[PDB]
Amino acid sequence: MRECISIHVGQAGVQIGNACWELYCLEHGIQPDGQMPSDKTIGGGDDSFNTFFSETGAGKHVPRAVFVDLEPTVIDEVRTGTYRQLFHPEQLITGKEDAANNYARGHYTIGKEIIDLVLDRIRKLADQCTGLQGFLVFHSFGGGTGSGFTSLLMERLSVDYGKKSKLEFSIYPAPQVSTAVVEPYNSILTTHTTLEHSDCAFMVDNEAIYDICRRNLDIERPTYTNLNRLISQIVSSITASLRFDGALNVDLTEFQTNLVPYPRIHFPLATYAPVISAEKAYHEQLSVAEITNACFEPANQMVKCDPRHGKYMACCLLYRGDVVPKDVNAAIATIKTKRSIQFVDWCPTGFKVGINYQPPTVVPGGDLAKVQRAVCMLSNTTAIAEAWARLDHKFDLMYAKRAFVHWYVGEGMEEGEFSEAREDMAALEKDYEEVGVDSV
Amino acid sequence: EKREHEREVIQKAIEENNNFIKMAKEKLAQKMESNKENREAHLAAMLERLQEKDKHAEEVRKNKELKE
Amino acid sequence: REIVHIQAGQCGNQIGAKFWEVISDEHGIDPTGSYHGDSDLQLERINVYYNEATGNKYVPRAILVDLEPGTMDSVRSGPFGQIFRPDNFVFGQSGAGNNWAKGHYTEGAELVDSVLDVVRKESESCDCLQGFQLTHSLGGGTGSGMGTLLISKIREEYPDRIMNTFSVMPSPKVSDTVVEPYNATLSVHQLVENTDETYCIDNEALYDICFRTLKLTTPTYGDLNHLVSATMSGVTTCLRFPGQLNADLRKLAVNMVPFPRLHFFMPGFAPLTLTVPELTQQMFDSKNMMAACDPRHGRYLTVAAIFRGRMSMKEVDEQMLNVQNKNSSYFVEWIPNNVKTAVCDIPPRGLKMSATFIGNSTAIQELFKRISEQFTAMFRRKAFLHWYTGEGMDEMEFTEAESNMNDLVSEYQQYQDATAD
Ligand SMILES: Nc1nc2c(ncn2[C@@H]2O[C@H](COP(=O)(O)OP(=O)(O)OP(=O)(O)O)[C@@H](O)[C@H]2O)c(=O)[nH]1
Numbered sequence: 001m002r003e004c005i006s007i008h009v010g011q012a013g014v015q016i017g018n019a020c021w022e023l024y025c026l027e028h029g030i031q032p033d034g035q036m037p038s039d040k041t042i043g044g045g046d047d048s049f050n051t052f053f054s055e056t057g058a059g060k061h062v063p064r065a066v067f068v069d070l071e072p073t074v075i076d077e078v079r080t081g082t083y084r085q086l087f088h089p090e091q092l093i094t095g096k097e098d099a100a101n102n103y104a105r106g107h108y109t110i111g112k113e114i115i116d117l118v119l120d121r122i123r124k125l126a127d128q129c130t131g132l133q134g135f136l137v138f139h140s141f142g143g144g145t146g147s148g149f150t151s152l153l154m155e156r157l158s159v160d161y162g163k164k165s166k167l168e169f170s171i172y173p174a175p176q177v178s179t180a181v182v183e184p185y186n187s188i189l190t191t192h193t194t195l196e197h198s199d200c201a202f203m204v205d206n207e208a209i210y211d212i213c214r215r216n217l218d219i220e221r222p223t224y225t226n227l228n229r230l231i232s233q234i235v236s237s238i239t240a241s242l243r244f245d246g247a248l249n250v251d252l253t254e255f256q257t258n259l260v261p262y263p264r265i266h267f268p269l270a271t272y273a274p275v276i277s278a279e280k281a282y283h284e285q286l287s288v289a290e291i292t293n294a295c296f297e298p299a300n301q302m303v304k305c306d307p308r309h310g311k312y313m314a315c316c317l318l319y320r321g322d323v324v325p326k327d328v329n330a331a332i333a334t335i336k337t338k339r340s341i342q343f344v345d346w347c348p349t350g351f352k353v354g355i356n357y358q359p360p361t362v363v364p365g366g367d368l369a370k371v372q373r374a375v376c377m378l379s380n381t382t383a384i385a386e387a388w389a390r391l392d393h394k395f396d397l398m399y400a401k402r403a404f405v406h407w408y409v410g411e412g413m414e415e416g417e418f419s420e421a422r423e424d425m426a427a428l429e430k431d432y433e434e435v436g437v438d439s440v
Numbered sequence: 441e442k443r444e445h446e447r448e449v450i451q452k453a454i455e456e457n458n459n460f461i462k463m464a465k466e467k468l469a470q471k472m473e474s475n476k477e478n479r480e481a482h483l484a485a486m487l488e489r490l491q492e493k494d495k496h497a498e499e500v501r502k503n504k505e506l507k508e
Numbered sequence: 509r510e511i512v513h514i515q516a517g518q519c520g521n522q523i524g525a526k527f528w529e530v531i532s533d534e535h536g537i538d539p540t541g542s543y544h545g546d547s548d549l550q551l552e553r554i555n556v557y558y559n560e561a562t563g564n565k566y567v568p569r570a571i572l573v574d575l576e577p578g579t580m581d582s583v584r585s586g587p588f589g590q591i592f593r594p595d596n597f598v599f600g601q602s603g604a605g606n607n608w609a610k611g612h613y614t615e616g617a618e619l620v621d622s623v624l625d626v627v628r629k630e631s632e633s634c635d636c637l638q639g640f641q642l643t644h645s646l647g648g649g650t651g652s653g654m655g656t657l658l659i660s661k662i663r664e665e666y667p668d669r670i671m672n673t674f675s676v677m678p679s680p681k682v683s684d685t686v687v688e689p690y691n692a693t694l695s696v697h698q699l700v701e702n703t704d705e706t707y708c709i710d711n712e713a714l715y716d717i718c719f720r721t722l723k724l725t726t727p728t729y730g731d732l733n734h735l736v737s738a739t740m741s742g743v744t745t746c747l748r749f750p751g752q753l754n755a756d757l758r759k760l761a762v763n764m765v766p767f768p769r770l771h772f773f774m775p776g777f778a779p780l781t782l783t784v785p786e787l788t789q790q791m792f793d794s795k796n797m798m799a800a801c802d803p804r805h806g807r808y809l810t811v812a813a814i815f816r817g818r819m820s821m822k823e824v825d826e827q828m829l830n831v832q833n834k835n836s837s838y839f840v841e842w843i844p845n846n847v848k849t850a851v852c853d854i855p856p857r858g859l860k861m862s863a864t865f866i867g868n869s870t871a872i873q874e875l876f877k878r879i880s881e882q883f884t885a886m887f888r889r890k891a892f893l894h895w896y897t898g899e900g901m902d903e904m905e906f907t908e909a910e911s912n913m914n915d916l917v918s919e920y921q922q923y924q925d926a927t928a929d
């Protein structure tokens with residue numbers, strides 16, 4: 001009851017899934033072979049962690065997850081890696097030829113050859129659920145599979161499961177680690193096509209993660225591994241309410257009610273604290289007040305933008321670890337009297353707080369220090385439209401000359417899809433302006 | 441009258457969900473069909489140009505043959 | 509995944525043999541096809557260029573084509589000559605007499621079907637063929653004419669695969685054969701329409717590098733092909749080793765070709781025979797380009813840079829940002845983030861660090877202008893035309909090839925002049 005199915009699409013989605021499921025296993029005491037000694041109900045149960053893991057009669061705890069990629073080299077490392085025993089082979093789906101950083105190949109040319117199989121395996125997972133709550137879809141904006149196949153899958157999922165909830169974790173492109181010039185094209189196309197089919201999307205700016213790793217962890221040149229371990233910490237903070245129980249634990253859907261005022265305005269800004277090296281953490285205990293203050297420093301955001309030059313429509317604090325409401329309320333009181341937190345006039349200015357008591361875990365041999373308490377803030381701020389603005393500007397610069405468009409037309413796309421998607425993005429920027437204007 | 445309105449509200453929710461599913465299905469079918477057509481058209485034009493090249497090569501060898 | 513390699517003509521077969529020697533050394537393959545390397549990184553993507561046969565033997569997925577037997581006999585007697593599949597040698601006897609029309613329409617047309625049989629046999633046993641790479645010269649007859657004919661036929665049978673060429677441009681500095689501007693213009697006419705990406709290996713640039721930079725008074729074809737082999741290993745590193753960026757031909761093309769006709773790349777190499785700033789500065793130096801064009805005479809549409817060796821990735825990133833910020837005028841502002849950088853830990857043979865540059869620059873119009881000037885100087889006096897009209901060709905074909913290449917130059921100029929505001 002209340003199961004969630006995770007779908008990891010493309011290289012970025014699959015590798016972030018790798019990090020997330022390793023972290024989940026560590027948080028729940030699940031061994032790489034799927035065994036969980038503390039689970040005394042064999043082959044089933046309705047424990048909180050069963051929202052994300054099903055159970056076999058042999059005692060294996062299996063992720064409710066599908067991994068999808070159009071080429072096999074990334075999922076092959078899952079098939080041969082540490083947690084290979086965790087998954088059933090049918091959960092790891094690969095093609096032979098990738099989408100070559102081409103939305104059109106991911107959505108149409110190559111994607112159409114594997115979409116039915118992927119939907120079949122997702123149906124096999126859904127049939128094991130007594131009360132499916134929805135899907136979590138991990139993907140990049142920039143990759144051919146991550147964009148086009150994700151858009152195809154989201155459309156097909158809307159068809160196969162109606163209004164059932166679909167959440168995204170979307171990797172926003174950054175030049176420091178980007179691999180394609182056309183990533184702005186792919187980003188705008190997939191955002192346009194997915195906008196109607198996603199109920200809530202958490203954007204992760206690779207540049208923001210990159211800078212957080214460099215600045216707070218003193219990693220000279222962060223790799224995908226560094227970025228993904230940090231991203232998995234944020235994802236775990238977000239899904240902890242679904243995977244653990246508690247008396248101060250507030251459900252993600254209850255946060256979502258506050259976070260989505262209009263169906264199109266469903267892009268929360270996530271901020272996470274603390275991100276600290278073990279050398280700095282040693283003998284430095286960060287308090288609830290310190291980490292809550294850190295939630296309002298832009299340098300800690302998942303997406304580069306300036307909330308101080310925008311307006312809030314929602315503010316959620318998701319604490320995990322040694323945290324009590326008295327300290328939370330004290331810190332929030334301090335922050336209000338000291339920070340640039342301006343709400344729109346049609347929304348209440350309160351902060352919604354949830355606390356999960358189970359402390360954060362870190363992957364052995366990682367860069368993050370083990371801390372006693374952490375917090376992820378989900379805020380609906382008009383500032384997130386800055387990311388759309390940057391992406392749309394790069395799009396406009398290339399499309400004014402029709403640069404690289406022939407690669408898409410050659411796969412069966414028309415220029416009208418480009419112009420229609422760009423107009424949808426312009427309307428989105430307009431929506432974010434309008435929601436921020438005061439009432440009359 | 442209240443009961444009638446309740447039935448109406450739930451029927452309207454069902455109708456809107458079903459119409460969402462229907463329009464999504466139809467838009468996806470239209471897009472995949474139009475895309476298949478466009479890509480096949482591009483490949484067909486490409487192969488037609490290559491066949492014109494073959495025809496021109498035939499013509500060239502003919503023109504050399506009647507030069508002897 | 510799999511690439512099918514074809515080498516056509518004298519130049520094509522010589523530079524192809526050197527390419528296979530170099531990358532067989534890099535992947536730990538000896539002349540008998542046995543692996544004797546020391547790093548699993550050598551074998552991870554070995555299937556891109558090599559078939560695996562019984563006894564764990566590695567056989568190049570290579571097809572050797574010529575209209576005369578000589579160069580291929582010498583290939584078969586070369587150091588790695590026995591590594592090639594014997595049935596993949598397809599040769600005739602007539603020769604092409606440095607005549608594009610003979611290569612393209614008559615002699616080569618007679619030979620092309622037996623080449624296509626081997627191409628088909630190699631492709632059919634591919635798990636997932638990406639496409640083809642062809643080595644040839646544009647100045648001769650077999651490489652130029654029959655290579656472009658082969659490109660058209662292969663494209664007819666594999667229209668959704670990537671077609672990639674390493675095309676050697678003629679220069680009076682290297683060859684004296686007078687009909688080379690005709691052969692090269694006729695070849696460029698075909699390449700513009702039927703290839704997806706073309707590395708312009710300019711013999712002018714190779715000569716100038718060997719003479720001015722390497723202090724070789726009398727450079728030989730060996731000296732030129734040393735540069736060619738180093739450049740080819742550089743530009744295929746991302747295809748041959750595990751990596752994130754430009755790891756296959758289609759992703760490379762998507763990153764490099766903003767407009768279908770503008771797919772002619774200027775390669776560069778450093779060092780020409782130590783620190784990361786020095787490597788970067790030299791790799792952007794005109795004197796390091798394998799096409800005789802000054803990039804500072806045009807603007808970069810797209811660039812790919814490949815660093816090989818053990819070095820600081822932070823320093824590589826810093827230096828690439830440095831060159832871009834300090835030379836921004838030379839990068840088109842309407843293609844954001846048009847420079848992509850890959851790093852491979854495995855350096856080439858004999859070097860601790862190296863850098864390979866692949867630029868799509870509008871300055872390539874200097875190469876095409878040179879060829880067009882030499883073409884027109886002969887065509888306006890109709891010199892040596894009977895060699896071509898005697899094979900059935902029409903003068904209109906020369907006029908059209910000239911027009912098409914002039915159009916290509918004007919298109920590079922249009923996008924060099926294009927502005928964002
Ligand atoms: N944070 C993070 N970003 C990644 C990771 N892998 C790739 N990316 C980003 O995703 C974008 C590239 O998309 P990919 O996921 O690699 O492409 P794809 O989904 O495999 O689609 P194809 O074109 O078919 O290969 C770039 O912006 C990368 O920076 C990862 O492991 N972590």
Ligand SMILES: Nc1nc2c(ncn2[C@@H]2O[C@H](COP(=O)(O)OP(=O)(O)O)[C@@H](O)[C@H]2O)c(=O)[nH]1
Binds near residue numbers: 517649651733
């Ligand atoms: N860099 C390099 N250029 C060559 C080589 N051989 C020929 N070329 C050039 O290629 C042109 C002639 O082409 P060639 O391949 O010999 O004629 P074909 O055998 O009939 O195709 C001339 O411009 C030569 O200078 C070589 O081995 N290396």
Ligand SMILES: [Ca+2]
Binds near residue numbers: 040041042
């Ligand atoms: Ca149980």
Ligand SMILES: [Ca+2]
Binds near residue numbers: 518
């Ligand atoms: Ca010759």
Ligand SMILES: [Cl-]
Binds near residue numbers: 229362363366368
């Ligand atoms: Cl960690």
Ligand SMILES: [Mg+2]
Binds near residue numbers: 011069098
């Ligand atoms: Mg991939």
